[PDB]
Amino acid sequence: ATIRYSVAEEMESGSFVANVAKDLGLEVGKLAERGARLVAEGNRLHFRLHRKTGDLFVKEKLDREALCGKSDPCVLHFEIILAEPLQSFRVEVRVFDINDNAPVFLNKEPLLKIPESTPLGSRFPLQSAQDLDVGLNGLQNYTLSANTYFHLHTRFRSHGPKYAELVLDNPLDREAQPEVNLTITAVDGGSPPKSGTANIRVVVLDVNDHVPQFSRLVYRAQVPENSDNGSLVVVVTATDLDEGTNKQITYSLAENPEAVLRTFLVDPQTGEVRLRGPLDFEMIETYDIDIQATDGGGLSAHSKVLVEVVDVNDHH
Ligand SMILES: *[C@@H]1O[C@H](CO[C@@H]2O[C@@H](C)[C@@H](O)[C@@H](O)[C@@H]2O)[C@@H](O[C@@H]2O[C@H](CO)[C@@H](O[C@@H]3O[C@H](CO)[C@@H](O)[C@H](O)[C@@H]3O)[C@H](O)[C@H]2NC(C)=O)[C@H](O)[C@H]1NC(C)=O
Ligand SMILES: *[C@@H]1O[C@H](CO[C@@H]2O[C@@H](C)[C@@H](O)[C@@H](O)[C@@H]2O)[C@@H](O[C@@H]2O[C@H](CO)[C@@H](O[C@@H]3O[C@H](CO)[C@@H](O)[C@H](O)[C@@H]3O)[C@H](O)[C@H]2NC(C)=O)[C@H](O)[C@H]1NC(C)=O
Ligand SMILES: *[C@@H]1O[C@H](CO[C@@H]2O[C@@H](C)[C@@H](O)[C@@H](O)[C@@H]2O)[C@@H](O[C@@H]2O[C@H](CO)[C@@H](O[C@@H]3O[C@H](CO)[C@@H](O)[C@H](O)[C@@H]3O)[C@H](O)[C@H]2NC(C)=O)[C@H](O)[C@H]1NC(C)=O
Ligand SMILES: [Ca+2]
Ligand SMILES: [Ca+2]
Ligand SMILES: [Ca+2]
Ligand SMILES: [Ca+2]
Ligand SMILES: [Ca+2]
Ligand SMILES: [Ca+2]
Incomplete structure (x- = not known):
């Protein structure tokens, strides 16, 4: 009923995708003869067909984070029209996701001011990061730098991590050190995994x-x-x-x-x-x-x- 292909994200423009004549039920000469033309809706013109060879090339560098955004299946639709007899063929090319985006924080330097007389076991929420990728290529885990006061507890969801929070293990004494400085690390699940670190400044109130x-x-x-x-x-x-x-x-x-x-x-x-x-x-x-x-x-x-x-x- 409909013919589909699969392509990789962010590959150079003009690169090969597939050969139409094979899975069209025709031959190359027929493609050249029957006037094989590519038509889709006016807004999208992502591909190009060479008639004489029946070769399908991609017209532009496909960016999945722009086309589909945060959608798991990134599919582009277009129809191949012929003539004598006039046939129309529905074609859909799926853009696979790659790990070309690392997790990032909007605040590279967040400021968390904790009073000295803070009860042991108290928890402090931290703003989550942003991995524009989807699936395993997206956010998967958080880690906290070596520390003598805190340990990190990451609240998870079914699909991905909700957010991370600091949990205080030791009593905060300003007279010792008035400030404790840390680096939270956001890590995805791609191979190799990509990291994104932010620097929290924890000020102890006297x-x-x-x-x-x-x-x-x-x-x-x-x-x-x-x-x-x-x-x-x-x-x-x-x-x-x-x-x-x-x-x-x-x-x-x-x-x-x-x-x-x-x-x-x-x-x-x-x-x-x-x-x-x-x-x-x-x-x-x-x-x-x-x-x-x-x-x-x-x-x-x-x-x-x-x-x-x-x-x-x-x-x-
Ligand atoms: C999210 O990540 C945490 C911690 O980060 C991971 O563990 C580190 C040790 C490194 O390997 C990081 O590269 C890695 O991302 C995971 O929790 C932790 O898992 C480890 C598994 O080895 C547990 O091992 C401990 O190791 C220490 C000394 O190395 C021992 O003292 C412990 O007794 C224990 O053997 C560790 O307990 C556990 N928790 C913490 C706070 O580190 C977590 O599983 C991971 N989650 C997902 C979904 O990926
Ligand atoms: C808050 O703390 C961060 C973290 O410092 C880092 O984490 C510790 C737990 C240890 O592992 C340290 O070894 C480690 O640096 C501070 O960030 C750090 O800033 C300095 C300079 O501002 C960076 O110094 C580097 O120096 C090497 C060699 O001199 C150069 O090659 C580097 O290009 C860089 O200049 C250091 O890399 C950086 N660390 C990280 C993880 O980004 C931060 O300064 C501190 N902030 C405050 C206000 O205290
Ligand atoms: C010995 O010195 C004390 C204290 O002198 C004081 O300290 C010095 C370092 C200078 O700064 C002086 O200028 C300062 O007065 C004298 O006691 C103070 O006397 C003055 C004047 O009688 C008082 O000022 C006022 O007194 C009227 C009286 O009704 C009150 O209503 C006002 O509200 C105002 O206080 C002052 O209170 C008084 N005490 C202090 C602590 O200053 C003292 O007179 C002098 N001589 C002897 C013999 O003791
Ligand atoms: Ca991309
Ligand atoms: Ca991507
Ligand atoms: Ca990623
Ligand atoms: Ca104290
Ligand atoms: Ca104090
Ligand atoms: Ca005091």
Whole structure:
């Protein structure tokens, strides 16, 4: 009823396809004589017939991804018309698929920002790739680069892979490495398989999971009673391994006896523990002051400075 042939994709134009006279029920001379003409719909003119030889050539480089797109059978139809007697013959040439397209990502550099306090076992979806081929020549599998935090889990469908997702195996600690960088690899199933890699940048968001720590737990100080107002008792420092607003330190005098808050002050920024009142050895020999370093998130830490006034009042 209908005659068909098979051709390979992306072969050079003018290349041979088949010989018509054989499977037409005629001979070459008959083809030349009966006026063998190729006719199809106006839009498609993919082939060419040489009458005198009965030879079928392809007129253009056939690109299957353009003609059929994502369709499994790529078939081109056209009819051979004759004359005396006037016969019409339906011909269909199938364009086989080859592996001339590798998988690719639209974002070669995706940006995935994961908070530091992320529960172990959490999953992060990744955008799939695009292999324009069909079947085994299309997408088949994903792989993840060597890593100490993640492992890749590829959600599959019946025909092909749905998409891939990162699964966290280890607790993310920003203080260790604030960023982890990876390369996802998309692999088809052709022979040889073709690959397409993308580069994921995983940024770890700082969480206030670090209380400020004072240098010394106890600050020893020996201050002369005849010292002036605003004289520097001591300088205290507090460190925070975090970043952002969860790092800046706010020093403060809190929960102290009246005398302390009456004769002492502290600089909220620098840590300048200084005087705001007079001193007399006979009245108060020693002060013990608990200062408080407060973090932006609210994590506070205490430390006591033990001041001891020196020299009898007006001894020298
Ligand atoms: C999709 O691909 C994954 C992993 O990728 C494949 O396996 C690698 C080892 C390489 O050979 C890649 O070229 C290849 O694409 C497949 O899952 C994995 O299959 C392998 C089969 O050998 C399993 O072997 C393991 O090997 C390690 C050490 O090499 C051992 O510690 C394991 O105990 C085990 O023997 C592996 O467990 C398995 N999973 C992972 C995460 O690698 C997957 O089968 C494939 N799917 C399809 C449909 O192709
Ligand atoms: C994110 O990480 C990628 C991955 O780096 C690669 O993966 C690791 C797991 C290891 O296997 C590394 O050995 C491997 O490079 C980085 O991509 C890499 O970029 C560099 C330069 O930007 C590329 O360097 C090469 O150097 C050789 C010899 O010097 C040249 O011949 C190459 O032409 C190339 O210049 C490296 O090839 C490339 N790796 C891959 C797989 O593409 C990426 O830089 C990094 N990004 C960030 C922001 O950290
Ligand atoms: C000894 O010094 C303290 C503190 O001096 C302060 O710190 C220095 C580094 C400089 O920056 C000074 O400019 C700064 O004042 C003195 O205590 C402070 O006195 C001033 C003025 O009396 C107070 O300012 C105001 O006081 C009025 C009074 O009603 C309030 O209403 C205002 O709100 C405003 O606070 C200031 O509060 C007070 N305390 C501090 C911690 O600065 C002190 O007067 C001086 N002399 C003696 C004898 O102690
Ligand atoms: Ca192609
Ligand atoms: Ca193809
Ligand atoms: Ca392919
Ligand atoms: Ca931490
Ligand atoms: Ca942190
Ligand atoms: Ca902190």
